[PDB]
Design a protein around this nucleic acid. Structure first.
Ligand SMILES: [Mg+2]
Ligand SMILES: [Mg+2]
Ligand SMILES: [Mg+2]
Ligand SMILES: [Mg+2]
Ligand SMILES: [Mg+2]
Ligand SMILES: [Mg+2]
Ligand SMILES: [Mg+2]
Ligand SMILES: [Mg+2]
Ligand SMILES: [Mg+2]
Ligand SMILES: [Mg+2]
Ligand SMILES: [Mg+2]
Ligand SMILES: [Mg+2]
Ligand SMILES: [Mg+2]
Ligand SMILES: [Mg+2]
Ligand SMILES: [Mg+2]
Ligand SMILES: [Mg+2]
Ligand SMILES: [Mg+2]
Ligand SMILES: [Mg+2]
Ligand SMILES: [Mg+2]
Ligand SMILES: [Mg+2]
Ligand SMILES: [Mg+2]
Ligand SMILES: [Mg+2]
Ligand SMILES: [Mg+2]
Ligand SMILES: [Mg+2]
Ligand SMILES: [Mg+2]
Ligand SMILES: [Mg+2]
Ligand SMILES: [Mg+2]
Ligand SMILES: [Mg+2]
Ligand SMILES: [Mg+2]
Ligand SMILES: [Mg+2]
Ligand SMILES: [Mg+2]
Ligand SMILES: [Mg+2]
Ligand SMILES: [Mg+2]
Ligand SMILES: [Mg+2]
Ligand SMILES: [Mg+2]
Ligand SMILES: [Mg+2]
Ligand SMILES: [Mg+2]
Ligand SMILES: [Mg+2]
Ligand SMILES: [Mg+2]
Ligand SMILES: [Mg+2]
Ligand SMILES: [Mg+2]
Ligand SMILES: [Mg+2]
Ligand SMILES: [Mg+2]
Ligand SMILES: [Mg+2]
Ligand SMILES: [Mg+2]
Ligand SMILES: [Mg+2]
Ligand SMILES: [Mg+2]
Ligand SMILES: [Mg+2]
Ligand SMILES: [Mg+2]
Ligand SMILES: [Mg+2]
Ligand SMILES: [Mg+2]
Ligand SMILES: [Mg+2]
Ligand SMILES: [Mg+2]
Lengths: 177, 79, 66, 115
RNA sequence: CGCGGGGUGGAGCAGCCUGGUAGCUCGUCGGGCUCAUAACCCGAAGAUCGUCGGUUCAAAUCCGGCCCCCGCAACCA
RNA sequence: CCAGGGCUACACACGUGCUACAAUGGCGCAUACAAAGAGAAGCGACCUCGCGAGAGCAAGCGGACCUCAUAAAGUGCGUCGUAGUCCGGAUUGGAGUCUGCAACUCGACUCCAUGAAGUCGGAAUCGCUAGUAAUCGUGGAUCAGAAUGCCACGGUGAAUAC
RNA sequence: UCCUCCUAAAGAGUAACGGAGGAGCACGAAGGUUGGCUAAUCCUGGUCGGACAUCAGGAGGUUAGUGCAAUGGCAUAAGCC
């Protein structure tokens, strides 16, 4: 909630001066944050997925989508329409709420932390983080989980170059290398 | 590691280095003193330490100081 | 959002040992207790202390001193 | 029960709790609780949050966890870049402190192999 | 040339028929017992399945080609 | 005759040890009781400096005089409560200490952090008949320094031999 | 015996011990209809995670898919929900 109001007032006005934008709509805005959890090991144990779903459902507000396998492949021993991973595509109000909770409290709790990667952009301003542990978020109780599992966060923007997209996230006091 | 009463170098190597450094860079110094430490003034020189049967050239860098000369000259060859 | 299927997304007060009080909204319960935040974490000093570790020549001079 | 990087023990004495931190052992942990002014006989469940904050600043003095791990990784990696006897010892996977390598050295060399 | 059947650790055999993680008996290797060798007891390694290909999500196993190897036919004047 | 290097190499195999895998144990704080040695470029108090190896000052003794030398198991309280654990203490990084012209190949010990295998061991197989086995210290010889070996010493102290 | 392609000479048909492949079923949802959707394969970033499982954007545009051969056909989608 607060970062959306902060963005509207403080960030836009900061980004308008950098690349001398003609319009207020030209500024990059954050479209959606897609959390992803390719549990994978659900081939052997079916409940292990339902454990991951509950953990994503804890981490994010909303309940995740169980994502089916797109094609069958021999390398992992999986078939067409088999539940292999989990996802959440949170956006709008709960997204800004999650985005504060991520950068403000969770990202600091990363073990062996130093500085997040500046090179990590797709060439179209869309960022992605890879969190090793679920424990970094304070939603998970310590004596509940029993697996070194994690997720990946994926910040989607309306930017055009990673150069342009860096400033957007940098304006939120986002930690880079 | 031993020795708190001054880091140890052989008289002959100290005088040979002091004579080499003041004159300028030239060639690998034949030295048999592996026991001798490496001073800061030795940086730049490509001194040739005796491995046992021959002399191994060692270009002395900023990190090679507290370490002794024999550390950069493997004696026993294997495979 | 689909009501019923989601968990309870309630408001809560984060309060670290540093002193930074901060209300947020999440699926936890009653209250929170934290170690570090975006403020108070050693990254601005961390990178200053971590990079300036090396130094072999002065370490030699500190022993000999002549 | 969340100081430094990790430290999350329970039903364990405060002196033995802090051994679980990487970079803090038996004697260091007694120096923490001596400076903080906490009894060794108590446990973390018994302790309050007002006392745990003092332990956080105390272990911040010593180099611990990822700070230490990099300091060790740097010092080992330094030796290998020099190409000194110890560096060759490290990268070849053989014991460093002038040890016997003929019969034993199984810790450093690893388990048994065929011929 | 024609129709069956084969080709799998160093050897001889299963596994193929119904595609999904290759056994058995010897031999080789390490250790025991013995004065020593054998026998015996105890562990262990060792085959991508003739080869070139296709089908398939995946081939020792399905399907053709190429080279084997082996059987049966190769007849009436 | 001399400088270094090597006898200390390491896919592996065996011999002999030691330390383990714990709760009859581990860790603290208390305190019990030995013997046999050894010592003059020797053994080195006591006092100070040391977190500790040790560093100074130096008492005494060629010794039932002085010194190395508080024996440890053992009691007595505490605390961990069966965990790869407050078990194990390997391995590595750093900081050192003495000896010694010199410690990197290649020493010993200390401190700090690190915390590997290992949960009583396949076929086999060894010693031991009482102050013996078992377990806990201790000394000496060689020795500038360098024992888990060797050679001695004494604690608690069994089972079984039809 | 049946299906698909070529032989088959731009309607149909057309032989050979001519050239290549399939069928002897499957499905109460894989039918009906209504309302939606768009694919392959790469590129770059991202925890374990690697060429490839799951995510994001970009590139391509039907090389895809069509219960099973081949043919003709399908975005109005006959495709996937
Ligand atoms: Mg050679
Ligand atoms: Mg220790
Ligand atoms: Mg030793
Ligand atoms: Mg050696
Ligand atoms: Mg054969
Ligand atoms: Mg089968
Ligand atoms: Mg056999
Ligand atoms: Mg086998
Ligand atoms: Mg197979
Ligand atoms: Mg074939
Ligand atoms: Mg020898
Ligand atoms: Mg040695
Ligand atoms: Mg053995
Ligand atoms: Mg013990
Ligand atoms: Mg006496
Ligand atoms: Mg005395
Ligand atoms: Mg004394
Ligand atoms: Mg005293
Ligand atoms: Mg003294
Ligand atoms: Mg005497
Ligand atoms: Mg007297
Ligand atoms: Mg003594
Ligand atoms: Mg006791
Ligand atoms: Mg005791
Ligand atoms: Mg146990
Ligand atoms: Mg284990
Ligand atoms: Mg211990
Ligand atoms: Mg441990
Ligand atoms: Mg036992
Ligand atoms: Mg037994
Ligand atoms: Mg047995
Ligand atoms: Mg037996
Ligand atoms: Mg016997
Ligand atoms: Mg007898
Ligand atoms: Mg003994
Ligand atoms: Mg002793
Ligand atoms: Mg003596
Ligand atoms: Mg001894
Ligand atoms: Mg008919
Ligand atoms: Mg035609
Ligand atoms: Mg026609
Ligand atoms: Mg015609
Ligand atoms: Mg015809
Ligand atoms: Mg047919
Ligand atoms: Mg349907
Ligand atoms: Mg359906
Ligand atoms: Mg249909
Ligand atoms: Mg429709
Ligand atoms: Mg309707
Ligand atoms: Mg097609
Ligand atoms: Mg078609
Ligand atoms: Mg056409
Ligand atoms: Mg239909």
């Amino acid at each position: 909630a607060k970062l959306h109001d902060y963005y509207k007032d403080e960030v836009v006005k900061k980004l308008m001066t950098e690349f001398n934008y003609n319009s207020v709509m030209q500024v990059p805005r954050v479209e959606k944050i897609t959390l992803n959890m390719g549990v994978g090991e659900a081939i052997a144990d079916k409940k292990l997925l339902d454990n991951a779903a509950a953990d994503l459902a804890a981490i994010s507000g909303q309940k995740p989508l169980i994502t089916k396998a797109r094609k069958s492949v021999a390398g992992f021993k999986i078939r067409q329409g088999y539940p292999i991973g989990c996802k959440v595509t949170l956006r709008g109000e709960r997204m800004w709420e999650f985005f504060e909770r991520l950068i403000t409290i969770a990202v600091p709790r990363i073990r062996d932390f130093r500085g997040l990667s500046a090179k990590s952009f797709d060439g179209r301003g869309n960022y992605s983080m890879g969190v090793r542990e679920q424990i970094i978020f304070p939603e998970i109780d310590y004596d509940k989980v029993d697996r070194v599992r994690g997720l990946d966060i994926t910040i989607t923007t309306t930017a055009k170059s990673d150069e342009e997209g860096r400033a957007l996230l940098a304006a939120f006091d986002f930690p880079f290398r | 590691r031993s020795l708190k009463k001054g880091p140890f170098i052989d008289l002959h190597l100290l005088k040979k280095v002091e004579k080499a450094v003041e004159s300028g860079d030239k060639k690998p110094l034949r030295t048999w003193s592996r026991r001798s430490t490496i001073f800061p003034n030795m940086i730049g020189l490509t001194i040739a330490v005796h491995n046992g049967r021959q002399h191994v050239p060692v270009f002395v860098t900023d990190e090679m100081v507290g370490h002794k000369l024999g550390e950069f000259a493997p004696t026993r060859t294997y495979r | 959002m689909k009501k019923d299927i989601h968990p309870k997304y309630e408001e809560i007060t984060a309060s670290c040992s540093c002193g930074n009080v901060m209300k947020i909204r999440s699926t936890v319960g009653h209250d929170l207790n934290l170690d570090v935040c975006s403020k108070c974490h050693p990254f601005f000093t961390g990178k200053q202390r971590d990079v300036a570790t090396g130094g072999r020549v002065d370490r030699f001079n500190k022993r000999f001193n002549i | 029960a969340r100081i430094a990087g990790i430290n999350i023990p329970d039903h364990k004495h405060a002196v033995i709790a802090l051994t679980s931190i990487y970079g803090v052992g038996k004697t260091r942990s007694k120096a923490i609780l001596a400076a903080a002014g906490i009894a060794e006989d108590v446990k973390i469940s018994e302790l309050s949050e007002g006392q745990i904050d003092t332990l956080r600043d105390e272990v911040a003095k010593f180099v611990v966890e990822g700070d230490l791990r990099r300091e060790i990784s740097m010092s080992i990696k330094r030796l290998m870049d020099l190409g000194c006897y110890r560096g060759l010892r490290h990268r070849r996977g053989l014991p460093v402190r002038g040890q016997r390598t003929k019969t034993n050295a199984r810790t450093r060399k690893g388990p048994r192999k065929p011929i």
